[PDB]
Design an enzyme around this catalytic site. Sequence first.
Site, PDB file in Angstrom:
ATOM      1  CD  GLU A 109      -2.379  -1.664   2.419  1.00  0.00           C
ATOM      2  OE1 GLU A 109      -1.701  -1.360   3.421  1.00  0.00           O
ATOM      3  OE2 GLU A 109      -3.296  -2.510   2.446  1.00  0.00           O
ATOM      4  CG  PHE A 115     -20.811   8.050   6.761  1.00  0.00           C
ATOM      5  CD1 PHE A 115     -21.524   8.470   5.651  1.00  0.00           C
ATOM      6  CD2 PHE A 115     -20.095   8.987   7.484  1.00  0.00           C
ATOM      7  CE1 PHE A 115     -21.522   9.797   5.270  1.00  0.00           C
ATOM      8  CE2 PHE A 115     -20.089  10.316   7.109  1.00  0.00           C
ATOM      9  CZ  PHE A 115     -20.804  10.721   6.001  1.00  0.00           C
ATOM     10  CD  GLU A 123      -0.983  -2.140   7.269  1.00  0.00           C
ATOM     11  OE1 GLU A 123      -1.789  -1.501   6.561  1.00  0.00           O
ATOM     12  OE2 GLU A 123      -1.327  -2.778   8.286  1.00  0.00           O
TER      13      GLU A 123
HETATM   14  N1  LIG Z   1       1.336   9.168   7.662  1.00  0.00           N
HETATM   15  C1  LIG Z   1      -0.071   9.221   7.310  1.00  0.00           C
HETATM   16  N2  LIG Z   1      -0.302  10.372   6.707  1.00  0.00           N
HETATM   17  C2  LIG Z   1      -1.540  10.670   6.278  1.00  0.00           C
HETATM   18  N3  LIG Z   1      -2.548   9.792   6.462  1.00  0.00           N
HETATM   19  C3  LIG Z   1      -2.317   8.614   7.077  1.00  0.00           C
HETATM   20  C4  LIG Z   1      -1.101   8.322   7.500  1.00  0.00           C
HETATM   21  N4  LIG Z   1      -1.141   7.097   8.074  1.00  0.00           N
HETATM   22  C5  LIG Z   1      -2.396   6.649   7.996  1.00  0.00           C
HETATM   23  N5  LIG Z   1      -3.139   7.572   7.384  1.00  0.00           N
HETATM   24  C6  LIG Z   1      -4.312   6.956   7.406  1.00  0.00           C
HETATM   25  O1  LIG Z   1      -4.379   5.757   8.335  1.00  0.00           O
HETATM   26  C7  LIG Z   1      -5.228   4.955   7.758  1.00  0.00           C
HETATM   27  C8  LIG Z   1      -4.933   3.542   8.145  1.00  0.00           C
HETATM   28  O2  LIG Z   1      -3.567   3.319   8.037  1.00  0.00           O
HETATM   29  P1  LIG Z   1      -3.016   1.762   8.009  1.00  0.00           P
HETATM   30  O3  LIG Z   1      -1.517   1.771   8.158  1.00  0.00           O
HETATM   31  O4  LIG Z   1      -3.380   1.114   6.702  1.00  0.00           O
HETATM   32  O5  LIG Z   1      -3.671   0.919   9.255  1.00  0.00           O
HETATM   33  P2  LIG Z   1      -4.732  -0.321   9.079  1.00  0.00           P
HETATM   34  O6  LIG Z   1      -3.966  -1.610   8.878  1.00  0.00           O
HETATM   35  O7  LIG Z   1      -5.589  -0.429  10.327  1.00  0.00           O
HETATM   36  O8  LIG Z   1      -5.622  -0.075   7.888  1.00  0.00           O
HETATM   37  C9  LIG Z   1      -4.987   5.174   6.118  1.00  0.00           C
HETATM   38  O9  LIG Z   1      -6.229   4.881   5.386  1.00  0.00           O
HETATM   39  C10 LIG Z   1      -4.666   6.365   5.951  1.00  0.00           C
HETATM   40  O10 LIG Z   1      -5.825   7.134   5.349  1.00  0.00           O
HETATM   41 MG   LIG Z   2      -3.954  -0.951   6.788  1.00  0.00          MG
END
Ligand SMILES: Nc1ncnc2c1ncn2[C@@H]1O[C@H](COP(=O)(O)OP(=O)(O)O)[C@@H](O)[C@H]1O
Ligand SMILES: [Mg+2]
Lengths: 247, 673, 261
Positions: free
Chosen positions: B281, B354, B294
């Site tokens: 991602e 939502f 991630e």
């Molecule tokens: N450094 C970041 N900067 C801007 N937005 C972020 C950042 N990190 C996360 N977001 C938001 O966090 C949300 C979830 O992050 P993620 O690492 O994928 O955790 P999860 O595994 O629970 O989905 C993302 O959809 C993103 O929109």
């Molecule tokens: Mg995630």
Amino acid sequence: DPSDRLVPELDTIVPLESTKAYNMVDIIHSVVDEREFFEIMPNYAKNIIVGFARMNGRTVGIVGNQPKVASGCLDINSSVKGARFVRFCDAFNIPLITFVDVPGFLPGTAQEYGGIIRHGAKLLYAFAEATVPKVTVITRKAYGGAYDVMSSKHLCGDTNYAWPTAEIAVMGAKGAVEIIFKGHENVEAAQAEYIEKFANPFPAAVRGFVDDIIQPSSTRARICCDLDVLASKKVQRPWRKHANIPL
Amino acid sequence: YDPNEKTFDKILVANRGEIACRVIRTCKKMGIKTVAIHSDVDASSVHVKMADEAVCVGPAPTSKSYLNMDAIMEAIKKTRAQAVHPGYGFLSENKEFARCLAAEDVVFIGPDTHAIQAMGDKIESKLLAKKAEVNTIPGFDGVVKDAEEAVRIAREIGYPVMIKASAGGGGKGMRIAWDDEETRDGFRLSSQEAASSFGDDRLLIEKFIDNPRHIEIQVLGDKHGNALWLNERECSIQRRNQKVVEEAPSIFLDAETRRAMGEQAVALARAVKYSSAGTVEFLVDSKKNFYFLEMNTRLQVEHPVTECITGLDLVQEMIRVAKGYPLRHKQADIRINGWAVECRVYAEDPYKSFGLPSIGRLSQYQEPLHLPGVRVDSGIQPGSDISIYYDPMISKLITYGSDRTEALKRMADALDNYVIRGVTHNIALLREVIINSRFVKGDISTKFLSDVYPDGFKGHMLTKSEKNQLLAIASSLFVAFQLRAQHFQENSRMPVIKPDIANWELSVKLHDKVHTVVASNNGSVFSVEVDGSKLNVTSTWNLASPLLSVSVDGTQRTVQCLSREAGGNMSIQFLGTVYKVNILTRLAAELNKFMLEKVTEDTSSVLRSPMPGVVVAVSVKPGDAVAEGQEICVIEAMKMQNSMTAGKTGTVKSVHCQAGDTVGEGDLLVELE
Amino acid sequence: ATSVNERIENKRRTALLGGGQRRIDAQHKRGKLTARERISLLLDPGSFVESDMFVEHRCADFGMAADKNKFPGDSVVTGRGRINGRLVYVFSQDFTVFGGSLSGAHAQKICKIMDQAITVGAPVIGLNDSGGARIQEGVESLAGYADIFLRNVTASGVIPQISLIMGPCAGGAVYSPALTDFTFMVKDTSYLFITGPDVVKSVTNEDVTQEELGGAKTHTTMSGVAHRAFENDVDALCNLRDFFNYLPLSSQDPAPVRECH
Ligand SMILES: Nc1ncnc2c1ncn2[C@@H]1O[C@H](COP(=O)(O)OP(=O)(O)O)[C@@H](O)[C@H]1O
Ligand SMILES: [Mg+2]
Ligand SMILES: CCC(=O)SCCNC(=O)CCNC(=O)[C@H](O)C(C)(C)COP(=O)(O)OP(=O)(O)OC[C@H]1O[C@@H](n2cnc3c(N)ncnc32)[C@H](O)[C@@H]1OP(=O)(O)O
Ligand SMILES: *C(=O)CCCC[C@@H]1SC[C@@H]2NC(=O)N[C@@H]21
């Protein structure tokens, strides 16, 4: 609305456990045409359900038990509620559809002091003198003489059906083992044998009490065809001014 | 698919619902015997009947049925299974599960234990990615020390300051700060919440990307060191950090950026020594600068959509890889073929938050499998029941076309021919998002649902022409029902005289307005006068089918009549939204004005629970005074916890919620003046 | 030489003696008669002819294939006789054999008697002394009640039906008396209830005995099920004789007219 429409949602509506309660109104809605049902006395004596519906465009009277309320036990009020509706339906030439799920009659001192025998006789007579076509479906259980009260095959009933989850007996397993195998004083294997042998519709099926054991999803298609062949029913009975209702 | 090749002869699926059905279908197509596991509640599920054999693993809660490793191992040993497929969720990404299975003889379809260990926490993953020459967020790397160190870092990372909980994520410990004093107070808040967190007590400071776009790259690898990237995926429409609408080809990316992203993903996968299917991602800004975020070491939920543009079967390929066969494709063999759009149909009410979970039993359920370019993946059937222990996912719907416009039109058509009666779904939100102008243009971000509906989802706001069409259709349906009610059979004793009426004058009440309608019938064609406007509607008028296809002024529409009663109330599904109308004759409407309005004894002061489940914590006691915007209690159901809000001031007379009990939907919870 | 003559005498002796002399003595120690002398007291002397005295039950489960579970008559005595010169059909139940529980042959005999009575147009008098339905018979027992119940509804309004409860009737057998025209009970000897006090205590957690649950006083004072209560068996039969003397034979006949002074 086609008369051969299947109802797959009825295959697992009846829970496997015998201590769980389901809703018969859902079954009635699924079976009848266009999910339309006109209920009579919906807030009084909720352990029985009576109403009008249409099957293949023909007006029918639906009567059934409600396991969700009081486990479906019959009492004073429900007997009169069903009897009056059945009498009217017969009086004005309307076929009857019955769904049977009853463990017996509600016990207690108040019921005996109120004359439950008279009202049970009222309901039994109302089903017994019926001359309009009658179709009966047994969902889960029918214990004791109450099974006769719900328009059994032997009360001049026309067609009787039983679902694979149905089961008919005299009393419960515990009562049977405690009234039969008293000297043996061992209910471990006795109860297992009784529930393996008699807790199923085959003893009534092999003796001709039920016409056939059908899948739930084909219930509606089974009823409509029957209403096509029973529309010309005619029964002759001895002459009388009027019989003696136990009113 | 070639069944001649040697492959496992027994696969055990350690999941439930939709993914289990997908895996069962795949192994059935591959001629592989399968084994299914289930709890007591799921004894009548779809996936336990599709698969040969079935093993009960425990009671309803997931902590004892699907997360109980001992039961799974006992079932595997008893069934003599050779391989186990976890799907996604549950034990799919469990470190100890992989070792426990690989101990005796069992092969696990998925990444190795080392791969899961490396891509399990957000600390070592970032440095591993940096060591592989992969673009990362320019935020500082290293465990924070104290407030002074935090602000010193915030000096050179940029004015926006992200604080994140390390290791496990799932939308916790993620907080904002801009100002240096705001940075330090947010940092101490993050420190205390991590002290109250699951136990990591480690914080990550990071930089924000403005208007983020969430891109994914699907990578596939084997044990021989080969890695392929199967195009990209656009997933930005999210609520509660959960994807709803998916699009396989990215309209925002060109060929060069896609190639660079795929090469970076392949390099990262090679660094980890990945030997299965996975996703990488990225977050992309407006300037097309992508940063790693991630990696998922499992099969993703939105995997079917990228199958519609590549023609491959991911489950079959990953099973073959787990068997030990090298990949039979090259990088140059992957090409984009058309466009594909996926929608995730949940069991929740979109009008609040939502989507808030709901339960029930499916009275009836029908899929639009006869429409062109439509694929449905579901793990339910008519009569299925929705419990409170598992994810509320109903189904997913995929539509493919030559280009974006055709796929969107097919999705809009399919969302109307989908019948679900028994529970509440979020189809209206999906159809509103699909036909949105911004979504059509292509300017979307992770906050798409936060600015289009700042207050919440209020349904489809219909224009004047659509309102006229809806009123005409409702009046025509009412007149058709009235006309059908007059058809009896010949009696030969008291012949019936059908009334001769030319025009029907009706009053139609919609929302809070009243319209006068004139209806005329000429067989199968109805002429409708709506406030001086001419409309002409035609249809077969089949009043029994759940789907009605009508033509109003040459425009084809599909409607569903959910509910109807003799009082005039009708519920009609138009354009994916359910509208309630009241239709009366002119005389009845005129006489109805003399009826006394029924008193309604509900003016706030009631805190009926908006969702069923089990309350975990109540923050108030009877006799206390509450404040606006203050949570009362937290109810946990279907993998999530929700706390209701406030907004009125009063004294709580009684509290009917205690920890450990079960509360139904619409049950009175808190009473106050 | 054929032994078909001694077997007839043995079967007749067993039918007259019921299930044994000890059960007969237990019947008398409660101040209670048996079916045959009840019939003799009810009917005119030398006017009763019995039907189907050589009918056996056809159970094959729970070890009733042995002779110890075989009894002629099957705990019911059925026939026709004359009261004051007018024809009547009667049936009485025997508590000696399986406590008067319904079997296939019992219901078959009752149904045959009812069919003959409705064919010729004569009243039916039923002396009820049972204990419910035979569990070992199974569903075949239940149908018997139905085969009786229908005949109680078909004959309703055609011929008079009189019922006299002489003992503790329980279970589904209590519905036949409720479907008849008149109901009489013997006080301190007869009972009527759907379920026993044990089930009431188990379910409703209430303590009550049989006398307060289904006694003659309860059913003649507040329940409204019975019509009259009599002191003992002889008085009950003596009153039933003249009560039958009041009413006619069938709805096709006019009301009886006697000689007045
Ligand atoms: N450094 C970041 N900067 C801007 N937005 C972020 C950042 N990190 C996360 N977001 C938001 O966090 C949300 C979830 O992050 P993620 O690492 O994928 O955790 P999860 O595994 O629970 O989905 C993302 O959809 C993103 O929109
Ligand atoms: Mg995630
Ligand atoms: C249609 C609805 C049904 O099926 S109702 C089925 C009956 N259910 C029951 O629980 C039995 C209720 N009966 C009784 O409790 C007693 O028999 C009553 C009516 C109280 C008589 O009082 P009492 O004098 O104390 O009985 P008892 O101890 O002398 O027993 C005499 C023998 O009669 C027998 N008996 C009775 N009923 C049945 C029956 N339905 N099926 C088979 N046998 C029956 C008993 O087995 C008893 O045998 P035993 O001589 O005591 O060894
Ligand atoms: C609960 O039953 C676990 C399965 C549902 C969650 C799984 S795992 C994470 C993925 N994200 C999502 O929304 N569903 C998938």
